[PDB]
Amino acid sequence: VAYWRQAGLSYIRYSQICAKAVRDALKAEFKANAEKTSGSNVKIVKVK
């Protein structure tokens, strides 16, 4: 239990940020490998 608990967040939310926080800290030579992940491909449409 930590401060992200009792706040409304989870582990998958924790893993998306400290991936990007590492992946934005890279040099400007390996920027395309941060685009290799590119999680913004799947879309979401709801039934209602």
């Binding site: 401060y3 967040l9 893993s15 926080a21 590492v22 800290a25 390996f30």
Partner: protein, 132 residues
């Protein structure tokens, strides 16, 4: 002894299936050495380094974004990693200004969910600056 050190990532497979001696695991509730009959524990990871110890002269250095251990009943630990990044491709100049940035935006959070999230962001950004 008799320990298949598995370790990978979705992009490129790292040290895999090889008998390596000692592994460092960066974990909430601290770091703990894996010593050859280590007690099985399914704990997930925090940001930090893995300095893995083999008989090949000297140790290697890596960096796990958010990983998971599953050390099994026998002597077989499997480590995973979303971003098992190498350290040398990191730029210190833009990396420092992020740490003072988010602390400057702490009191602009009018809700209670994001106020933990900026506390997550400085902890991830404090994790690299001790490392580098």
């Amino acid at each position: 002894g008799q320990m298949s050190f598995t370790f990978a990532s979705p992009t490129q497979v790292f040290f895999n299936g090889a008998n390596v001696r000692q592994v460092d695991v960066p974990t909430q509730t601290g770091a703990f050495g894996i010593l050859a009959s280590h007690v099985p524990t399914l704990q997930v990871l925090r940001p930090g380094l893995v300095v893995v110890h083999a008989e090949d002269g000297t140790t290697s250095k890596y960096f796990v974004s958010s990983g998971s251990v599953t050390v099994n009943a026998d002597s077989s630990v499997q480590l995973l990693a979303e971003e098992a990044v190498t350290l040398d491709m990191l730029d210190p100049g833009v990396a420092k200004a992020n740490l003072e940035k988010a602390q400057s935006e702490l009191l602009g959070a009018a809700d209670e969910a994001s106020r933990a999230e900026i506390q997550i962001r400085i902890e991830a950004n404090e994790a690299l600056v001790k490392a580098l």
